[PDB]
From a paper:
We expressed and purified Bacillus megaterium GVs that form narrow tubes most suitable for cryo-EM analysis. We used a combination of two- and three-dimensional (2D and 3D) classification techniques to select 4% of the small GV subset corresponding to 35.6 nm diameter and used helical reconstruction to obtain a cryo-EM density of 3.2 Å resolution. The cylindrical shell is constructed from thousands of GvpA2 monomers polymerized side by side into ribs spiraling into a left-handed helix with a helical pitch of 48.8 Å and −3.87° helical twist, resulting in 92.93 GvpA2 units per helical turn. Contrary to postulated models, GvpA monomers and not antiparallel dimers form the repeating units of the helical assembly. The inner wall of the GV shell forms a continuous hydrophobic surface consisting of a dense pattern of hydrophobic residues located on the luminal side of the β-hairpin and helix α1. We located pores in the GV shell formed by slit-like openings between α1 helices of adjacent GpvA2 monomers. GvpA2 monomers are held together tightly by lateral connections along the GV ribs formed by an extensive hydrogen-bonding network between the β strand backbones.
GVs have therefore evolved as rigid, thin-walled structures composed of a single protein unit that typically polymerizes into large cylindrical shells closed off by conical tips. The ∼7 kDa primary GV protein GvpA forms the core of the GV shell and the cone-shaped tips. Here, we report the 3.2 Å cryo-EM structure of the gas vesicle shell made from the structural protein GvpA that self-assembles into hollow helical cylinders closed off by cone-shaped tips.
Numbering used by the authors:
A (entry chain N), B (entry chain N), C (entry chain N), D (entry chain N), E (entry chain N): 2 to 66
């Protein structure tokens, strides 16, 4: 191709650049009464391409040893 | 590309620059009566890219030893 | 880029400069009758980027020893 | 940048300059009858950036020894 | 900057100059009948920046010895 005065790029390349960084959303909350932990919530979400989800899974320990 | 008189940058690069710094929102409250801790709340939220959520997780201790 | 006669900066850089200083909001109150501490409240909130929330957490003692 | 005839500065820098000095609001009251301290109130509030809230916390004694 | 014929200064600098002097408001009253101190009130309020509230607290004795 040829060089241009503008940097702007394609939608499919925005998607690819998002997925090979990935996203983690992570949260917890706890509610206690008189010292007893009467309610608790924990949640996590991960989104990525395969080659980066393997990075996550190999560090956390979901692949075979 | 070529140099310009203005610095302004793309939306996908704002998103990437936010996620590789990450965000932590952290809070607790306690209500006590006669010296007994009759109610308590604690919460935390984390948002990041995978490579920076691993920074958090390795310092706090969520990865295998 | 090139130098200009004005200093003004981008919204994403205001956000980044806030989060790498962080914010702490901290309060307590106590109500006592005849010498007995019949009611008490304590609360704290913290907001930061990951690299500065780790500063807080390492000084207060939330990371593994 | 270049020098100017006026000193005026940005809103984000006012906020930063407030938070790295911090604010303490501190009060108590006591009501006594026949020599017995039948009612009492105490309250405190602190606001700062992380690096200055640590100054407060290290002098008052909220960090690990 | 450059020198001018007038001394006037910014609102954020008025606030800073107030808080690093601080304010103390202090009062008590006592009502006695036949020689018995049947009612009494005492109150205090303090406002400052952190570095000057520590001056108060170190002289009165609220910091660890």
């Amino acid at each position: 191709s040829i060089q241009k005065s503008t940097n702007s790029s394609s939608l499919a390349e925005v998607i690819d650049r998002i997925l090979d960084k990935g996203i983690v959303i992570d949260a917890f909350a706890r509610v206690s009464v008189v010292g007893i932990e009467i309610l608790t919530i924990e949640a996590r979400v991960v989104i990525a391409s395969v080659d980066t989800w393997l990075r996550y899974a190999e560090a956390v320990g979901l692949l075979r040893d």
